[PDB]
Amino acid sequence: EKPTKEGFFARLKRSLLKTKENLGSGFISLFRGKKIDDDLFEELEEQLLIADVGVETTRKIITNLTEGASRKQLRDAEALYGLLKEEMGEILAKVDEPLNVEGKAPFVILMVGVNGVGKTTTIGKLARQFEQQGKSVMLAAGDTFRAAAVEQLQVWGQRNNIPVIAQHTGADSASVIFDAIQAAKARNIDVLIADTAGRLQNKSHLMEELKKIVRVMKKLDVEAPHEVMLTIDASTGQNAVSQAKLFHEAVGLTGITLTKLDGTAKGGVIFSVADQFGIPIRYIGVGERIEDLRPFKADDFIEALFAR
Numbered sequence: 467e468k469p470t471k472e473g474f475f476a477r478l479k480r481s482l483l484k485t486k487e488n489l490g491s492g493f494i495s496l497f498r499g500k501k502i503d504d505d506l507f508e509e510l511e512e513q514l515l516i517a518d519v520g521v522e523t524t525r526k527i528i529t530n531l532t533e534g535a536s537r538k539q540l541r542d543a544e545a546l547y548g549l550l551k552e553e554m555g556e557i558l559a560k561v562d563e564p565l566n567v568e569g570k571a572p573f574v575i576l577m578v579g580v581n582g583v584g585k586t587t588t589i590g591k592l593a594r595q596f597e598q599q600g601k602s603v604m605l606a607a608g609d610t611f612r613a614a615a616v617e618q619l620q621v622w623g624q625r626n627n628i629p630v631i632a633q634h635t636g637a638d639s640a641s642v643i644f645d646a647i648q649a650a651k652a653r654n655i656d657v658l659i660a661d662t663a664g665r666l667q668n669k670s671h672l673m674e675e676l677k678k679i680v681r682v683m684k685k686l687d688v689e690a691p692h693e694v695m696l697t698i699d700a701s702t703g704q705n706a707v708s709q710a711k712l713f714h715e716a717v718g719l720t721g722i723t724l725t726k727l728d729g730t731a732k733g734g735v736i737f738s739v740a741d742q743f744g745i746p747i748r749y750i751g752v753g754e755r756i757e758d759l760r761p762f763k764a765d766d767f768i769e770a771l772f773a774r
Contacts, residue, residue, distance in 0.1 A: 475769065475770055475773070478767075478770040479773055481752040481758075482733065482770055484731035485730060485733025486733075486771060487731055488513055488517040488731065489519075489771060490554075491771070491772055494544075494547060494774060496543075497543035501543060502535060502540055502542065506543050511525075517732045518704065518738065520734065520738035520741075522738075522742070523741040523742065527550070527554060530556075531549055531550055534549045551772045554737060554768065554771075555765065557740050557741050558736070558737070558764035558767060558768060559765070560740065561722075561744060561745060562747070562762060564761040565695075565761070567596060567657050567692070570656070571654070571656070572647070572655045573658070573692050573693075574647065574658045574683060574691045575660065575693045575695050576679065576683070576693070576694045576717075577661050577695050577697065578696050578697075578713050578716075579709070579713065580664045581609075582699075583702065583709070583725065584699055584723075585661070586619070586661070587725070588749075589619070591756050591759040593626075594626075601656035601657050602653075603628050603656070603657045604628065604655045604657070605619050605660070606630075606631045606646030606647075606661065607619045607633075608639045609662060609663045609665075610635065610636065610663070611665075612663070615664075619632065619661060620632050629649070629653070633645075639678070640678045641682075643679055643682060644683070644686065646658055662675070662679065669716065672712075676713075676716050676717035677716075680694075680717065693748075694717060695720070695722070695723055695748065696709070696710055696713050696714070696719050696721070697722075697723045698725070698735075700726050700729070700730055700733065700735045700750075700751075701730035702735075703735060706739065707742060722743075722746065722747045723749045724736055724749070727750050727751060728753055733771075736750070750767070
C-alpha cells in the first residue's frame with residue numbers, strides 16, 4: 467500500500483485503545499441519553515480523575531465545559547462531546563511544538579529524567595530518527611557513576627555505528643559532556659544527545675549536578691544545551707507529573723517526551739502535564755518501534771482519542 471492519513475490514524479487509535487475506554491470516545495457511553503445537570507458533571511469529573519487527568523486540570527476542563535454549555539444553553543449531555551474535544555484540544559495545543567534539531571554544530575540535547583521511565587530507550591530511538599533524516603549523531607554517557615548505564619550506551623553505539631563519549635565509572639559528568647561537545651564539533655556531528663544521572667540524588671545534589679553540566683556546556687557554546695528534554699512514563703500517573711515538577715525546578719526544561727501512552731488505560735497524564743507546566747511535549751511513545759516515538763501533534767492526538 468501507501469502511507470495514508472487513514473492508515474496512520476487506524477494505528478494511532480488502536481495504540482490508545484486502553485485509554486479511549488475512559489477518555490475521548492470513552493465519553494460517548496457516559497453521556498448517552500442523559501440530560502445536563504450537576505450529577506452529570508460529577509460523573510464526568512469522576513471519569514476524568516480515574517483516567518489520571520489530575521484534580522486541577524479536571525476542575526479546569528469541567529469549569530470551561532460548563533461555561534461553554536451555558537453559552538449555548540445545551541440540555542442534552544450527548545452534545546457535550548464536541549465541547550470537551552475542543553477544551554481538551556485547547557490544553558494540548560498550548561504544548562504542541564515539535565522539536566527542530568537542525569542547523570547547529572552540534573545541536574545539543576540534554577536528556578534528564580529518572581532511570582526506568584524510558585529515557586535510555588528514547589535516546590536510542592531519537593538517535594535513529596535523526597540518522598534516518600540524514601543527520602549525524604553522537605551520544606554522551608553522562609550518567610558517570612552508573613557503569614550499567616554507561617556500558618549500555620557504549621555497546622549500543624558500537625553496534626549501531628554511533629560514536630559514544632564516555633569515561634571511567636566515577637568520572638565527572640560535566641567533563642564527559644564537555645569532551646563530548648568538543649568531539650562533536652571536531653567531527654562535524656549534527657546532534658549530540660547527552661545522558662545524565664537518573665538515579666535521583668537529593669534535590670540539592672540533583673540541581674547542583676544539572677546546573678554544573680549546563681554551565682560547562684556554555685563554556686563552549688552559549689546555546690548549549692539547545693534542548694533540555696525530560697522523559698516521563700505516562701503509565702506512572704501522577705509520578706510523571708511530580709517528576710516533571712522536580713526536574714523543571716532543578717534545571718529548567720524546554721521539552722518533554724512522554725512514553726508508554728499505549729500501555730495504560732488511564733491516559734490523562736498528558737493533559738495534566740500539558741496544563742500544569744506549559745512545556746512543549748515534543749514526542750509521545752505509542753509503541754515499541756522507532757517510528758512509534760511520534761512527534762507530538764495535538765490535533766492528530768485529539769482526533770485519534772475522540773474518534774469512535
